[PDB]
Amino acid sequence: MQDAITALINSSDVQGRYLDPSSLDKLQNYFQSGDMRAKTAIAVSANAKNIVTKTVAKSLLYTDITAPGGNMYTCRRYAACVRDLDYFLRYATYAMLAGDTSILDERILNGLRETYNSLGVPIGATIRSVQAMKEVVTSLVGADAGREMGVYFDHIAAGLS
Amino acid sequence: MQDAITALINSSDVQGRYLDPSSLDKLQNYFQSGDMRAKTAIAVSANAKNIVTKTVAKSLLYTDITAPGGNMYTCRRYAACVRDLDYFLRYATYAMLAGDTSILDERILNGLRETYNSLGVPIGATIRSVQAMKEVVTSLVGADAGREMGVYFDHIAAGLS
Amino acid sequence: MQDAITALINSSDVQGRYLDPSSLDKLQNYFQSGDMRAKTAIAVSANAKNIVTKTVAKSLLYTDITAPGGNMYTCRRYAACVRDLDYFLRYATYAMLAGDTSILDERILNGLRETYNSLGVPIGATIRSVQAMKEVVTSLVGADAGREMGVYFDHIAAGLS
Amino acid sequence: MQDAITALINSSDVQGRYLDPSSLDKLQNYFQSGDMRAKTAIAVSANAKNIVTKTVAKSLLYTDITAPGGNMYTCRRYAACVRDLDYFLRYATYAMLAGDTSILDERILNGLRETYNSLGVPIGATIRSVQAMKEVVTSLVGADAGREMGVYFDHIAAGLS
Amino acid sequence: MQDKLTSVAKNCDLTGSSLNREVVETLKEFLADGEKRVQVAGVIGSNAAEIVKTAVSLLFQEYPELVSPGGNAYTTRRYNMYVRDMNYFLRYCSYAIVAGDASVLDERLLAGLRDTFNSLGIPLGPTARSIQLMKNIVKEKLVTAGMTNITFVDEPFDYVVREISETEI
Amino acid sequence: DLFKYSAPVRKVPQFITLFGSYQKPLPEQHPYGCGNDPLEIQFGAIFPQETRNPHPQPAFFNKDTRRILIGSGAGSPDKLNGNALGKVPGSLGTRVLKLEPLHGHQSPSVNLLHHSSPAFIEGAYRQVFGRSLYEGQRQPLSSTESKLLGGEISVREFVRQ
Amino acid sequence: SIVTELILNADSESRYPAPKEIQVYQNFVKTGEQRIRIAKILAENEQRIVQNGSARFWERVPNTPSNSGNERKTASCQRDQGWYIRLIAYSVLAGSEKPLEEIGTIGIKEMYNNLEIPLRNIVECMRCLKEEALSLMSEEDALEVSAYFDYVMRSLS
Amino acid sequence: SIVTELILNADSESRYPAPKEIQVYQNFVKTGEQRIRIAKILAENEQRIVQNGSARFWERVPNTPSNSGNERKTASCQRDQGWYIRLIAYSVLAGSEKPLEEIGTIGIKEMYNNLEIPLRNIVECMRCLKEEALSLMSEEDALEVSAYFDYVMRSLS
Amino acid sequence: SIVTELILNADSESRYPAPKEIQVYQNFVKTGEQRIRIAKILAENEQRIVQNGSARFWERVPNTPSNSGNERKTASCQRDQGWYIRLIAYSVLAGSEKPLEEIGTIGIKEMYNNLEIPLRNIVECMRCLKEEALSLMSEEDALEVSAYFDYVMRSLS
Amino acid sequence: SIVTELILNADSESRYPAPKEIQVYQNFVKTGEQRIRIAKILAENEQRIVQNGSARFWERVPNTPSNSGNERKTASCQRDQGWYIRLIAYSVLAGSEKPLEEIGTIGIKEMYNNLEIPLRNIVECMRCLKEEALSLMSEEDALEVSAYFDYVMRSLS
Numbered sequence A, B, C, D: 001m002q003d004a005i006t007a008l009i010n011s012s013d014v015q016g017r018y019l020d021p022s023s024l025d026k027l028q029n030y031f032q033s034g035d036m037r038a039k040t041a042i043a044v045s046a047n048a049k050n051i052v053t054k055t056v057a058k059s060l061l062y063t064d065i066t067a068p069g070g071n072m073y074t075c076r077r078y079a080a081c082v083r084d085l086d087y088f089l090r091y092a093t094y095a096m097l098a099g100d101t102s103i104l105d106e107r108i109l110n111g112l113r114e115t116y117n118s119l120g121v122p123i124g125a126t127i128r129s130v131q132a133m134k135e136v137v138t139s140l141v142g143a144d145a146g147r148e149m150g151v152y153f154d155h156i157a158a159g160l161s
Numbered sequence E: 001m002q003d004k005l006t007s008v009a010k011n012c013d014l015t016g017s018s019l020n021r022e023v024v025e026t027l028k029e030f031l032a033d034g035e036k037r038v039q040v041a042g043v044i045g046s047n048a049a050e051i052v053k054t055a056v057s058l059l060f061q062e063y064p065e066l067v068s069p070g071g072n073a074y075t076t077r078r079y080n081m082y083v084r085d086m087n088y089f090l091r092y093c094s095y096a097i098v099a100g101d102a103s104v105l106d107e108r109l110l111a112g113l114r115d116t117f118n119s120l121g122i123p124l125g126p127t128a129r130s131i132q133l134m135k136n137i138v139k140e141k142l143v144t145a146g147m148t149n150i151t152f153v154d155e156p157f158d159y160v161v162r163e164i165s166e167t168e169i
Numbered sequence F: 001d002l003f004k005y006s007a008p009v010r011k012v013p014q015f016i017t018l019f020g021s022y023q024k025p026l027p028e029q030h031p032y033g034c035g036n037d038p039l040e041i042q043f044g045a046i047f048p049q050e051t052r053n054p055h056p057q058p059a060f061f062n063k064d065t066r067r068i069l070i071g072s073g074a075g076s077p078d079k080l081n082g083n084a085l086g087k088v089p090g091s092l093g094t095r096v097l098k099l100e101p102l103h104g105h106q107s108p109s110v111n112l113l114h115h116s117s118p119a120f121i122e123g124a125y126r127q128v129f130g131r132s133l134y135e136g137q138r139q140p141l142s143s144t145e146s147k148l149l150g151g152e153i154s155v156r157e158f159v160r161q
Numbered sequence G, H, I, J: 001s002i003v004t005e006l007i008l009n010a011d012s013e014s015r016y017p018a019p020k021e022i023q024v025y026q027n028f029v030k031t032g033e034q035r036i037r038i039a040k041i042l043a044e045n046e047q048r049i050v051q052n053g054s055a056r057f058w059e060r061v062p063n064t065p066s067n068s069g070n071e072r073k074t075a076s077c078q079r080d081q082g083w084y085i086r087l088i089a090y091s092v093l094a095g096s097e098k099p100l101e102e103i104g105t106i107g108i109k110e111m112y113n114n115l116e117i118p119l120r121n122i123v124e125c126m127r128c129l130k131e132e133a134l135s136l137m138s139e140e141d142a143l144e145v146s147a148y149f150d151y152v153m154r155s156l157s
């Protein structure tokens, strides 16, 4: 994975020169935003279970997915979907702390669509769940931090679609 | 793996018959060439590091491939390229001693192009470096042994193409 | 591991003879007692958690073992003691079902004293807990089945002493 | 392990000096005996299972060991004894080829006594079996090579006591 | 070594249950059979030589190769050793019958017996068979004497067999 | 053993140990004897030699005895809670070496995993061999390392190699 | 015995016996009397089973060590047949092939290859012994005895 | 062949052939004329070796599937003898038992057990073939051939 | 970067960042001003550091390919010095040696041995560069720079 | 020794040595006389080889710890040269580089790094010693000597 600093270092190293003033400005911006990122990470860590509960309740419950023959039927598949949502939330928090989306690409979205298609996991339902998770996180942490986490939630949703 | 003698034996065995006089003549030719093959193997073992450094110096150094952003930039990629050239030289020597290219097709070229394409390794630069290594070996071991090793160097280059 | 039938078969086999009338009578006794053995196994399985709870309550709780500095202090050590009592109950049930104590010799008592002395586990408190467990099981399953289970409980206790 | 050449090399090396004329003479003796050692190894390899069969027939069959209750009773214990004899024969051949008993001490004898004592294997019976195996080998191969192999068979027998 | 009463009394302090109902019941049950144990021991002691002789003769009938050349009972030296050891087994089994406890067998009969028998090449199968033959002869003599509930007489012999015999299953 | 001339060479008592162990269940030791138990250190196979300071204490372990082992409590948190009650000093609990499998463009200059590739390879060597190898000793396995870094083989296959 | 298998199956999962194990145990305990009767039948008829099976086996497979004029080899073969009948009786008593497997099946190929006894001949002898033993019992009594004989035959191949 | 064996030995340590492997290679290529001569001897005399060995084998083991009145079985056994002589010639040419190992030794027991051909009979037949083959060779030329015949027999037993 | 290290340390336990990791993260982001200042110092003074270190290294080690009379070799050596100063600036910015390790430390010995440049000479040049760079920074400010220079030297040795 | 290598290779597969391995063993023991002669040649000429190689090595590499004016360091370098000549003689005797690798090659870099001796200088000295040794020997006998000197040089580089 990479964070903001490592991404700037990579962009500068490919062309073989020190960080130009624009890269240093972006680095200073990330350093300033670090405190807000830490507070958001603490809040999401404290309310992860509630976030996933509300996401499932407002996105997947009482649909054909949880009915017999659906993909969330049986306790094993329900637990697997809840675990996937846990993964999405935790790695979105990781990406928000890092300032870069590369952790999502490397650990989450790397061949996730193919795995879901082979297993039979509805991609559209998962995207709707990710959007609902973004809404829940926004309602919990606020508008600014909400949209900061929503950037990575939208990255996950776009990588799934 | 398979060498010249095993190749002749298998050609005869697939018909359930002893080695016909043409196969015996080819076997005698291989036996006669074995001394020169062993001499070439000894020379290449003695000058392996020199061969690889001369190959890199005359093929890949001071080009865009070692400038920042090139595939031989950073020390780890340079070391990986040097290790790959060492593999090419050693297995070409194995093939020359065996008198057959089966070892090359089994240990080196089986999926090498796919791996290089996945990593972004330039195939053309690798082929050029293999040609340079063939020229260096020809300079070191003379004309006859030089082209004897060049047979397997060209086999490697064709497999990469 | 040997049960009653396997023990009789072994004793007859070292002599190279079919089962003599005495061993056949012992086998018939085991077959007759099998129904009671199955009932006792069912009863102990149904009440295993309660048996261990009562054993701990009447033999270990509110003593210096559960106080700080005691071997049942901290949650991990308390859980490990409960796990050990579960082990003893389950293997005593196994031995009662088999009608033979060899399972306890090969899987419970072998190296148990050295392991407990290495860990600092109180041997006397363990023996008293096993006695309490035997009393609880006897009160639960009756005098006859209680005595039959107490045979193996006493085997464990005597091995520990 | 360690063979005759390595033994002489180490004897010279602990003193930090080249091989003295006596060690050179011993090395020449080993080099001259190598042909006989190779022929004996070929002969033992060809008739290994026959050698073990004759050994078992000569020393173990129709005794109280194979009778019911004996240590070679049941098919698994018979096969285990045969496996141990196979190990002894193969490693005696190894030691004869090497000209040293070092491999026997390292691989076969270091712990065999305590293992046999723990298993209840009669050590006197296995010593008699090894001596019978020495007799079988000396009858198959000859007098001189039979004596050479009997050196290592005797070393095995001495290490078993 | 310990007898039944000593082991029970020491376990009374060891287990922390003291003299509870189960201990009293086991003690009463054991004491009910004490006179029969003494009578069984008296019968065994009064007929020891006959029991051992009968058992060894039956053993050589069932293992005719034992007395043939190359057998373990070959020659009078080894025959005398057979008789001596069977007398050992009978004596310690009578001790265990009196005591009501197998600790005497553990301490003075079975400790190191397997090591000795492996050293001397004594076959364990015939040993177990001879012990069982002696047990059967003792049971026959006890039935002749009129004894009725003599199940405990089986306990030592069988136990000894289980301790000396190899594991087959 | 006392009547032999080697009696004054054995220093560990032979009588009181056996007399004490007569009254005890099976010892905490390998079924093949105390000489089959290595020292539980970071690296090195240190065993009690039979012939040097002999103190073997064989016991009659049958084929069905199962040893009692003290769990170290190590492992990832997901692979826990079934045997989490163990705790052993010197255990790196959650510090297990794990490498997620790899799944047309060259990689970034700085891509960071939990352990760098040399660090992970050194950890694998330090676990399999107990310690880091010397300088040139890793030469035979270089190709294997490459196949681990390119995703050709898993960590299981790398460990097997 | 089947009881040991049930207990070990439960122990493999670190749990008390499940209802399936308990049902197997109860069925076996119920059938124990029939198993004892079958074992007694096998014990009391062992010699005639051995004799008739040997006669049929030598008629069917005359080229065997037991039919080579060697009295000792014939005696050893008939002793082996008696031993395998005894092991099958043990297995009938125990409700599982565990006694037969542990005493006469594991390592049977290695033992008989060391003795240089052809395995096909032993399979044929086992088949003849099975044919002669099954005639002495009812069909339901023969149901398990045939299975144990088949187990020996399968292990020899 | 031995060339592939030594190349694989060098490759197992990921280094160029050491002087030991080079010496093995040189000693192998210096005996090429002798190996070709031995292979030619085996090919020319294959039929007479097969006939004499089969005669001795049927004298020593009369009761075997290759002489039971079945012409096809006899033809198949003699064909197998010729095939094994051919494989031994391959091994002599290659300087290693590898060709024989790949073509007629890996899974030889399974193949001949599927065919219900006793393995010890094949061992005796190979012994007779070895006796016939070594009697038309020089004293020094018989070492490799004897080793390969022993390899076949050992793989069978 | 140490932010990545914290995230992956939390990831190995499959848990959100603990308060200890959050404290480390906050302490790190509070030093961004100083890290950017040090990186600017290294970028501005790269050429003078390279020149002075080259002079001192050629004085200390006169027999090196850098000053063997080949201007191309001299230019390549000075470019390498500048590149390693750049990598050290990257490491200072990231807070850890990971960028330097990934770009110019893994495989450095193999690369320079292929280039046929003695590693001890590169160690001496790194020492000269370190002593030139430390003099341009204050104490408690060039601790990480000296640590990274020692990291390069240790990788070379 | 090559005998130990063959035996260990056979043992890893739990099989008797293959015919090819027996041929390797026979060919090795066949050439024992020449190996003893070469080892005697190396032993007799060790001192003059060390002297001439030291002269050439100090002429070619004057900035080395040996000729830094320390008599003990010079003596230790001479002793090391003699020791490596002795180990090469051992390897010639054993037919394999196992003696040299097990006495003076495994951990050579660690030992000489702890001693703070530049490895390139040791490589140069080994090359000078190899040239001196090859001077006082026929090429056919010097094949293994040069191979083992190259083995040492590769282990140091």
Ligand SMILES: *[C@H](C)[C@H]1/C(=C/c2[nH]c(/C=C3N=C(/C=C4\NC(=O)C(CC)=C4C)C(C)=C\3CCC(=O)O)c(CCC(=O)O)c2C)NC(=O)[C@@H]1C
Pocket (backbone or CB within 6 Å): A060, A061, A062, A063, A066, A067, A072, A073, A074, A075, A078
């Ligand atoms: C009743 C005994 C207890 C209880 C239950 C309760 N459940 C729900 C909702 C759901 N229950 C399930 C259950 C399952 N899904 C499966 O795949 C399986 C395995 C066959 C089971 C058992 C699911 C999926 C839901 C979600 C709704 C849906 O069906 O789509 C509720 C309502 C939850 C809510 O917040 O609306 C309740 C109340 N409640 C109690 O108090 C009892 C102890």
Ligand SMILES: *[C@H](C)[C@H]1/C(=C/c2[nH]c(/C=C3N=C(/C=C4\NC(=O)C(CC)=C4C)C(C)=C\3CCC(=O)O)c(CCC(=O)O)c2C)NC(=O)[C@@H]1C
Pocket (backbone or CB within 6 Å): A060, A065, A071, A072, A076, A077, A078, A080, A081, A082, A084, A085, A087, A107, A108, A112, A115, A119, A121, A122, A125, A126, A129
């Ligand atoms: C929940 C929103 C939806 C859903 C999910 C679902 N997923 C699986 C199975 C898998 N999920 C993953 C995903 C990951 N594993 C990882 O390690 C990571 C990164 C940390 C991710 C993103 C994988 C790999 C699998 C396959 C393996 C496994 O099952 O663990 C299931 C189970 C499918 C089955 O039939 O077994 C389910 C149900 N399904 C829905 O319907 C939701 C919309």
Ligand SMILES: *[C@H](C)[C@H]1/C(=C/c2[nH]c(/C=C3N=C(/C=C4\NC(=O)C(CC)=C4C)C(C)=C\3CCC(=O)O)c(CCC(=O)O)c2C)NC(=O)[C@@H]1C
Pocket (backbone or CB within 6 Å): B060, B065, B071, B072, B076, B077, B078, B080, B081, B082, B084, B085, B087, B107, B108, B112, B115, B119, B121, B122, B125, B126, B129, F106, F107, F142, F143, F144, F145, F146, F147, F149, F150, F151
């Ligand atoms: C050098 C001439 C060119 C070059 C090479 C290069 N290769 C890699 C990476 C790999 N190379 C291989 C090849 C092999 N590994 C083997 O084990 C064998 C058989 C013995 C072969 C042929 C593999 C598998 C990889 C991937 C795994 C690894 O990294 O080791 C790299 C690194 C690429 C990266 O992005 O890390 C490089 C640079 N590149 C050039 O530009 C030269 C023309």
Ligand SMILES: *[C@H](C)[C@H]1/C(=C/c2[nH]c(/C=C3N=C(/C=C4\NC(=O)C(CC)=C4C)C(C)=C\3CCC(=O)O)c(CCC(=O)O)c2C)NC(=O)[C@@H]1C
Pocket (backbone or CB within 6 Å): C057, C060, C061, C062, C063, C066, C067, C072, C073, C074, C075, C078
């Ligand atoms: C209180 C918040 C809740 C509760 C508690 C409760 N606990 C007990 C008895 C015990 N509690 C412990 C606890 C610990 N042992 C340890 O080692 C640690 C970690 C350091 C802890 C927390 C123990 C050992 C006992 C046993 C009694 C003893 O003192 O040895 C009780 C009494 C139960 C009983 O009498 O059987 C209670 C009630 N009960 C509630 O209702 C709260 C939710």
Ligand SMILES: *[C@H](C)[C@H]1/C(=C/c2[nH]c(/C=C3N=C(/C=C4\NC(=O)C(CC)=C4C)C(C)=C\3CCC(=O)O)c(CCC(=O)O)c2C)NC(=O)[C@@H]1C
Pocket (backbone or CB within 6 Å): C065, C071, C072, C076, C077, C078, C080, C081, C082, C084, C085, C087, C107, C108, C112, C115, C119, C121, C122, C125, C126, C129, F068, F069, F070, F071, F072, F085, F086, F087
């Ligand atoms: C409870 C009655 C008493 C008590 C027990 C206690 N035990 C441990 C730890 C261990 N117990 C065992 C025992 C076994 N493991 C097995 O597999 C078997 C056979 C089925 C047995 C008998 C072991 C091996 C351990 C070591 C740890 C582990 O679980 O692997 C503890 C904790 C010791 C520690 O601190 O490590 C305790 C407290 N202690 C008492 O005071 C009670 C009288």
Ligand SMILES: *[C@H](C)[C@H]1/C(=C/c2[nH]c(/C=C3N=C(/C=C4\NC(=O)C(CC)=C4C)C(C)=C\3CCC(=O)O)c(CCC(=O)O)c2C)NC(=O)[C@@H]1C
Pocket (backbone or CB within 6 Å): D065, D071, D072, D076, D077, D078, D080, D081, D082, D084, D085, D087, D107, D108, D112, D115, D119, D121, D122, D125, D126, D129, F063
């Ligand atoms: C045959 C001549 C005698 C005989 C042997 C016998 N051995 C076993 C079992 C084992 N023997 C060993 C011994 C070794 N371990 C080693 O490392 C080596 C060197 C390579 C040897 C020789 C081992 C490890 C076993 C395994 C025991 C097990 O079953 O786990 C048996 C079987 C014993 C049993 O109880 O099953 C036998 C019978 N016995 C005789 O009576 C012959 C005189």
Ligand SMILES: *[C@H](C)[C@H]1/C(=C/c2[nH]c(/C=C3N=C(/C=C4\NC(=O)C(CC)=C4C)C(C)=C\3CCC(=O)O)c(CCC(=O)O)c2C)NC(=O)[C@@H]1C
Pocket (backbone or CB within 6 Å): F041, F042, F043, F044, F045
């Ligand atoms: C050096 C100060 C002295 C010295 C040391 C020496 N040690 C060995 C070999 C081993 N050393 C160990 C020690 C450890 N094992 C561990 O797990 C740990 C903790 C991490 C330590 C310190 C072991 C197990 C060995 C065995 C071999 C191995 O490397 O695995 C040797 C080599 C001896 C040999 O015969 O191989 C030496 C020389 N010797 C001295 O004379 C110094 C005073």
Ligand SMILES: *[C@H](C)[C@H]1/C(=C/c2[nH]c(/C=C3N=C(/C=C4\NC(=O)C(CC)=C4C)C(C)=C\3CCC(=O)O)c(CCC(=O)O)c2C)NC(=O)[C@@H]1C
Pocket (backbone or CB within 6 Å): D060, D061, D062, D063, D066, D067, D072, D073, D074, D075, D078, G064, G065, G066, G067, G072, G073, G074, G076, G077, G078, G080, G081, G083, G103, G104, G115, G117, G118, G121, G122, G125
């Ligand atoms: C009869 C069906 C076949 C056959 C028999 C045959 N047996 C032997 C000799 C032995 N048989 C055994 C068998 C066993 N040992 C065990 O522990 C068990 C498990 C209970 C068995 C079955 C053994 C050990 C021997 C060796 C002699 C001994 O008892 O010590 C022979 C060989 C006789 C000889 O000495 O030549 C033979 C021939 N022969 C046939 O033809 C039938 C196919």
Ligand SMILES: *[C@H](C)[C@H]1/C(=C/c2[nH]c(/C=C3N=C(/C=C4\NC(=O)C(CC)=C4C)C(C)=C\3CCC(=O)O)c(CCC(=O)O)c2C)NC(=O)[C@@H]1C
Pocket (backbone or CB within 6 Å): B060, B061, B062, B063, B066, B067, B072, B073, B074, B075, B078, I064, I065, I066, I067, I072, I073, I074, I076, I077, I078, I080, I081, I083, I084, I103, I104, I115, I117, I121, I122, I125
């Ligand atoms: C200067 C301190 C020392 C010196 C160096 C030297 N280097 C070269 C040539 C090259 N140097 C590199 C360096 C790198 N490539 C990378 O990817 C990295 C990681 C960031 C580094 C540091 C490379 C690739 C080359 C090859 C040429 C090229 O750049 O394409 C030379 C010239 C070599 C030649 O033979 O031409 C020299 C002299 N020499 C010394 O003596 C100093 C100790």
